[PDB]
Design brief:
This is part of a larger assembly, with chains A (about 60 residues), B (about 160 residues), C (about 180 residues), D (about 50 residues), E (about 170 residues) and F (about 230 residues). With about 160 residues, chain B is an alpha+beta fold. Chain B contains 2 helices and 7 strands. A 5-stranded antiparallel beta sheet of chain B has the order 4-3-2-1-5, with no helix packed on it. Chain D is elongated, with a radius of gyration of 22 Å. The chains are: A mainly alpha (about 60), B alpha+beta (about 160), C alpha/beta (about 180), D mainly alpha (about 50), E alpha+beta (about 170), F alpha+beta (about 230). Chains E and F meet through helix 1 and strand 3 of E and loops of F. The structure holds geneticin. Chain F binds 3 RNA strands through helix 1, helix 2, helix 3 and strand 6.
RNA sequence: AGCGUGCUACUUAUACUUCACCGUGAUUGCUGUUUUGACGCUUUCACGAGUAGGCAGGCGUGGAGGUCAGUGACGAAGCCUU
RNA sequence: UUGCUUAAUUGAACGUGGACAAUUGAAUGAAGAGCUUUUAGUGGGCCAUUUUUGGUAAGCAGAACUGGCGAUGCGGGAUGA
RNA sequence: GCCUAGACCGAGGACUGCGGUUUUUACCUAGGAUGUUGGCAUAAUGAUCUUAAGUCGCCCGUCUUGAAACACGGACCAAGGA
């Protein structure tokens, strides 16, 4: 009495291609989330030291 | 009812190759992966730890993280009208360097060498690849090669 | 028939005139439309499009942001240009002598500029004394500091502000926000 | 305001292609070709007739 | 006018192992050169294991009738496909060119066997030089002594709708 | 005052154009000599191919012509009921209406492109006169995203002069002999908007030319079709 | 005037080509002549199917502020009328 | 540069300074690209070729890709989503 | 290269451009039709109404995958009506 259509993927790719399918956008610096914590911890100190060394070198 | 478990439908994809069962040859564990390498994902059925999902079997991605026994690979997956950045942790038994990249680096080296040669020689070299062109003209001799006539053959039965 | 590669009859989607009905704003638009049409100085085209902007797209510019703009290397003598309102900032310890061109000055901002020997001038005066926008510096206010912007893109793990009328312990701090109440998204 | 076919309008033809005057005046379209009467197929190529 | 006879000569593309590939010729009855080269590649792909992509056409040439105003009897050997199988057959035609006899053969197998052009392979067309090489009586009866015959019941084709005189069929 | 100013302004125009015409007279010499040089090399190319064929017959050899480098592709199918991949291919060839025609340089990449669109196009190898007739009658240039008639050599030179294309005959030469800047010249040409053929098509179009239809490669008969449609 | 096949011409869709006109979108230029319209004028090109639905520009009705020192018993409003 | 790593002056990641400039490293195209807010209707579908399941089968029931009808007139199939 | 038979159209509105003939700051077929002649203005000419002929045209609204439906509401008109 209420038997109806169960499932179909008809028209679904047509809908997806109206405004997609968009590639995700890339950046020069990726987020360091999910990167190994030990590496990320030391990478903080390396970037900090580089900034100080460059600031000192620019000073003299 | 229906069954949609984690490894459903992987009966053949996760089987080992014929007469290729048993221990992993150690070259798998001696390869070195760096962040930014391009790797192919292939599940090894004998290593149940750090496996890909069946979706990532046969996909290729970028290494973004390196741990004790595994790498993190970035994959783009289509979900509806856009891609989603996926991050998968894979033990190195399920990963392999991609060969096309090493070929492309070969081309970069060769191209720099040629441009340096032309620079130091006083000429200019064109370095874009080109698709196959139509062939040019040519003259064919008949010395020992008189054209031989062929005809369609009659029908025959071999029962 | 045509196999259209793009959508037909699409308006550009950029505002080509102020929605404002102010006659004096339209006088300024007339001036800078002439200037952008006859001068090929990029400053005039930028000023022309800026006059079209809506109120939220012209955030107020504080005098402290102006003074930080004037501390750039070589910018102490520039004419600061604001297409919008310049507001006063009492957190500012000191303000220098400067020329500022703006649509509007609040009373405190104008008093502060004039007391330090500066010049608070309008955009037609700027056009008369810098028809190409020579030695100008355009300063824009913070667009994303609006309170409405806190609630844009709200969703699980997005870390945005919920749309809520009261704030307190009983208002949306339970299930869904706390692992002790089920889950936390 | 009106596109004129150079293949039909002579003035537009000469406006676009000045060499059209030299082509016409030199009768390039009906130019004779000097050469000798030859029959280069009389040998093996006559295998067009039978193999 | 439907068909012409062509020769088509081709070979494999030269390679390091085989710098001088053999040249192969075919005699093709086709409406134009595009169809002629297509037929050549069709037959070369069926006989030898060569594809179009690895070969090249060397020459395409009209083969004209030697004696276009000499009455001839031709024997034609055919392989054709019916609705139910594949058959060989031999028929005879009278014409002044090979192309004329081939066009007649195509019409004839269309008429009597419902055999379309795509279903027929022309094995061989031979000019029958002797009266003893002519086998079929439907052409043999036109090779007899002092042949003559009337054309009874001539129907004249009129240029008007209405005729003021009674019809006649004398001739 | 108005009458004297216009007479004063007209004589300014007349004096100014007396100088431009001198400066234009030198440039018209350049394009004249180029077209004279192109005509010479076309005839020299034709006679040399004839000579090489005749020499091959004598020396018991076969001369194989250089494979065609150029095709002209006409869309002869309407815009309804096209599968996605040939539809995209036809869009990438700028063939977005029935009876639109473009020039395509032949390589492996473009050959596979045209392979995809085969049951919707008619194409072949255009002759020199066909190219000239198409460019002269239905030649339009893409100037600032606008279809502009190629009615003056100034229009051609202001848009392709940086590629050493200064005249309509330079453009025709660059198309016919597939030159270094075939890409820019062919993309500058708006897709040709042809009529239906005078005399119609064959009884049924949408099957290959080989099987008696109208689609695919017809290899010298594209010129007869274009004469029907141009 | 049936069936198989080849050919020549011919017929005609809101399709294609050229031209006219309407609209939409873009586009050229316009202040010592910008001059009482610059929300205007002007050069050029492309495009036009549509339910549900969205938006835009307009037409019409009762009443209100302002204006036309507006119409009207020499006929307002209403109504009938190739 | 680093607090990570190496027996190590080994590496890892990110850099300073110097070299390579329009063939910046395949084709074709590109009424341009990117970003944001907000809200309508809808959430019964059906048909055709091919693949395909249950069923003797069905103008039957159920999936896959595509194109359509629904939402669409027009020329043709006499008539017909 | 030349000769030759018909049809449809005439947008724009001082000049400005590109070319051509050079006889020359002139002329041209070269940035869109002009010349000339007859008739009529008590009229041919155009527009609408009625009707005849040719051709095409099922009853709207609605729910629906699908309506002209042997699915539902609607005899007609005015005023009210979300
Ligand atoms: C080589 N495999 C073929 C596969 O190519 C395909 O063949 C189609 C064939 O089915 C189509 O034919 C189909 O569609 C036509 C019509 C509606 O187009 C019908 O007349 C026909 O009955 C129907 N079988 C035919 N027109 C093209 C082939 N490539 O489908 C059949 C197949 C056996 O799987």
């Amino acid at each position: 009495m209420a038997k109806s259509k169960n499932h179909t993927a008809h028209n679904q790719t047509r809908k997806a291609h109206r405004n997609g399918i968009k590639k995700p956008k890339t950046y020069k610096y990726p987020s360091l989330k999910g990167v190994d914590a030990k590496f990320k911890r030391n990478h903080r100190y390396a970037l900090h030291g580089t900034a100080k060394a460059l600031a000192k070198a620019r000073a003299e | 009812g229906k069954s949609r478990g984690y490894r459903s439908g992987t009966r053949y994809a996760f089987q080992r190759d014929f007469k290729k069962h048993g221990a992993i040859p150690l070259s798998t564990y001696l390869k070195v992966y760096k962040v930014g390498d391009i790797v192919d994902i292939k599940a090894n059925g004998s290593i149940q730890k750090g496996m890909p999902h069946k979706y990532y079997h046969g996909k290729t991605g970028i290494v973004y993280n390196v741990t004790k026994s595994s790498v993190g690979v970035i994959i783009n997956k289509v979900v509806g009208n856009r891609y989603i950045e996926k991050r998968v942790n894979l033990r190195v038994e399920h990963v392999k360097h991609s060969a096309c990249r090493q070929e492309f680096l070969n081309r970069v080296k060769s191209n720099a060498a040629k441009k340096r040669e032309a620079k130091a020689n006083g000429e200019t070299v064109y370095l874009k690849r080109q698709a196959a062109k139509p062939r040019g003209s040519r003259i064919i001799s008949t010395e020992g090669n008189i054209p031989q006539t062929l005809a369609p053959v009659a029908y025959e039965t071999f029962i | 028939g045509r196999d259209h590669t793009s959508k037909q009859h699409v308006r550009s989607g950029h505002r080509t005139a102020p929605k404002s009905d102010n006659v004096y704003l339209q006088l300024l638009v007339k001036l800078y439309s002439f200037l952008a049409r006859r001068t090929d100085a990029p400053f005039n085209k930028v000023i022309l499009k800026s006059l079209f902007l809506s109120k939220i797209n012209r955030p107020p510019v504080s005098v402290s942001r102006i003074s930080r703009a004037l501390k750039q290397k070589g910018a102490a003598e520039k004419t600061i240009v604001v297409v919008g309102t310049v507001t006063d900032d009492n957190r500012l310890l000191e303000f220098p002598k400067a020329t500022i061109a703006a649509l509007r000055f609040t009373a405190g901002a104008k008093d502060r500029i004039l007391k330090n020997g500066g010049e608070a001038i309008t955009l037609d005066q700027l056009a008369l004394r810098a028809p190409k926008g020579q030695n100008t510096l355009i300063v824009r206010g913070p667009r994303n500091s609006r309170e409405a912007v806190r609630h844009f893109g709200f969703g699980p793990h997005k870390g945005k502000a919920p749309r809520i009328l009261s704030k307190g312990r009983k208002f949306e701090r339970a299930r869904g926000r706390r692992r002790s109440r089920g889950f936390k998204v | 305001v009106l596109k004129k076919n150079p293949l039909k309008n002579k003035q537009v033809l000469l406006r676009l292609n000045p060499y059209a005057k030299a082509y016409a005046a030199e009768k390039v379209g009906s130019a004779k070709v000097e050469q000798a009467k030859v029959k280069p197929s009389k040998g093996q190529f006559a295998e067009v007739l039978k193999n | 006018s439907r068909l012409n006879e062509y020769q088509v000569i081709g070979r494999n593309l030269p390679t390091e192992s085989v710098p001088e590939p053999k040249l192969f010729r075919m005699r093709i009855f086709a409406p134009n050169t595009v169809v002629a080269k297509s037929r050549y590649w069709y037959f070369l792909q069926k006989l030898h294991k060569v594809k179009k992509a690895s070969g090249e056409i060397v020459s395409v040439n009209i083969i004209s009738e030697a004696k276009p105003t000499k009455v001839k009897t031709f024997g034609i050997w055919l392989r054709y496909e019916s609705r139910s199988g594949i058959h060989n057959m031999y028929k005879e035609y009278r014409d002044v060119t090979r192309v004329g006899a081939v066009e007649t053969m195509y019409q004839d197998l269309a008429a009597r066997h419902r055999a379309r052009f795509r279903s027929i392979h022309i094995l061989k067309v031979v000019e029958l030089e002797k009266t003893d090489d002519v086998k079929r009586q439907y052409v043999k009866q036109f090779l007899t002594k002092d042949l003559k015959f009337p054309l009874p019941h001539r129907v004249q084709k009129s240029k008007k709708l209405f005729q003021a005189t009674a019809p006649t069929t004398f001739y | 005052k108005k009458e004297k100013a216009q007479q004063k302004t007209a004589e300014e125009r007349a004096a100014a154009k007396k100088v431009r015409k001198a400066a234009n007279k030198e440039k018209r010499k350049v394009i004249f000599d180029r077209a004279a040089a192109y005509q010479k090399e076309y005839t020299e190319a034709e006679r040399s191919v004839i000579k090489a064929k005749r020499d091959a017959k004598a020396s018991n050899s076969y001369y194989v012509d250089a494979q065609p480098k150029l095709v002209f592709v006409v869309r002869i199918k309407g815009i309804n009921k096209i599968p996605p991949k040939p539809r995209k291919v036809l869009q990438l060839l700028r063939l977005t209406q029935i009876n639109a025609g473009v020039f395509v340089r032949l390589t492996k990449a473009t050959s596979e492109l045209i392979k995809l669109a085969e049951p919707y196009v008619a194409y072949g190898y255009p002759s020199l006169s066909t190219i000239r007739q198409l460019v002269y009658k239905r030649g339009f240039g893409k100037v600032n995203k606008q279809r502009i008639a190629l009615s003056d050599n100034a229009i051609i030179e202001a848009n392709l002069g940086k590629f050493n294309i200064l005249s309509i005959e330079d453009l025709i030469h660059e198309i016919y002999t597939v030159g270094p800047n075939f890409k820019q010249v062919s993309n500058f040409l708006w897709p040709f908007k042809l009529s239906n053929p005078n005399g119609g098509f064959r009884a049924r179009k949408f099957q290959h030319f080989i099987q008696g239809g109208d689609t695919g490669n017809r290899e010298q008969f594209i010129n007869a079709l274009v004469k029907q449609m141009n």
